[PDB]
Design a protein around this ligand. Sequence first.
Ligand code: A1EMO
Length: 127
Amino acid sequence: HMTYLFSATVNLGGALAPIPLLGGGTRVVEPITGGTIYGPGFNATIEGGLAAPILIKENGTTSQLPWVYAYGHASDGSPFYIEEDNTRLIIQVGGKYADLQKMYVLGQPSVNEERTVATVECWSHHH
Ligand SMILES: C/C=C(C)/C=C/C=C(\C)c1cc(O)cc(=O)o1
């Protein structure tokens, strides 16, 4: 029914100040400077990317809509690209981890208070 795949530790660079959006939300751009993915289902080095969450208040409560784009190489050398939008993660990689493309991958990300490190635990749902 559900299988643990990997965790990720993501190093975040200097974020840009919030961008005011029409309607009252804000977009916060957080460059990714590196990080590591480790687990039974995926092992890789994060080389770059960005998070671009949107913060929007609806009915008095701020919801954060995550958007994340990251890339690197897997432990076998294969380039990968991950897009995040619980949240769904779409993993595009060939080589030994290629079967991740066939999986419905969900992630639970958290960011430390100072917003220098994001961590996420990811698992596949056998729908
Ligand atoms: C393989 C999964 C990865 C690399 C996830 C990265 C998530 C980040 C950097 C993050 C930042 C943020 O402000 C909100 C959020 O949801 O996630």
